[PDB]
């Protein structure tokens, strides 16, 4: 199917962070057990950006672009803010595995697509500066870290997606 992205809540006034080239796409999850994709987009629209901002949200079968790409972001709380080409938030409010999987698939596909768009390798949590990095990986590896965030692995584990499965899906693409 064609990928559809809702840009209705794209917050243009967010600050410039660092400069090109941006070597990373960041994989996050919201840490919010109750919010919908629209709730997240609406809060992101109005919030103090210092609390954290990002570029995309995946949830409820939809993808919303909520911030600029190729801009950096205040998403990971340390030096790799200045490497953020894009930062994708998966919602955490799924009632069932089936509903989770619909969004998980979109999440994998979007992370891969954003890496392609940025000219970055479709790799997960490698040591190279370039690639797709989780918030956990940024927290543990970036210079000047101030975060304690370790998303999205705990939420993926809630729904039976292991570290290895997530890496395989990012790096090889989805299969049946």
């Amino acid at each position: 199917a064609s990928m559809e992205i809702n840009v209705s809540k794209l917050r243009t006034d967010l600050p410039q962070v660092g400069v090109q080239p941006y070597r990373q796409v960041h994989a996050h999850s919201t840490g919010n057990p109750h919010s919908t994709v629209q709730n997240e987009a609406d809060y992101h629209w109005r919030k103090d950006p210092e609390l954290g901002f990002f570029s995309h949200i995946v949830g409820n079968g939809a993808i919303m672009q909520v911030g600029p790409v190729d801009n950096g972001a205040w998403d990971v709380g340390g030096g790799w803010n200045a490497e953020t080409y894009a930062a994708v938030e998966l919602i955490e409010s799924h009632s069932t595995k089936e509903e989770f999987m619909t969004d998980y698939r979109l999440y994998i596909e979007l992370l891969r697509n954003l890496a392609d768009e940025a000219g970055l390798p479709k790799t997960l949590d490698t040591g190279s500066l370039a690639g797709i990095k989780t918030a956990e990986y940024a927290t543990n590896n970036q210079p000047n870290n101030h975060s304690d965030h370790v998303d999205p692995y705990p939420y993926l584990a809630k729904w039976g997606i292991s570290r290895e499965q997530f890496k395989h899906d990012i790096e090889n693409g989805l299969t049946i």
Partner: peptide
């Protein structure tokens, strides 16, 4: 998420 999270300027730090």
């Amino acid at each position: 998420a999270x300027k730090x």
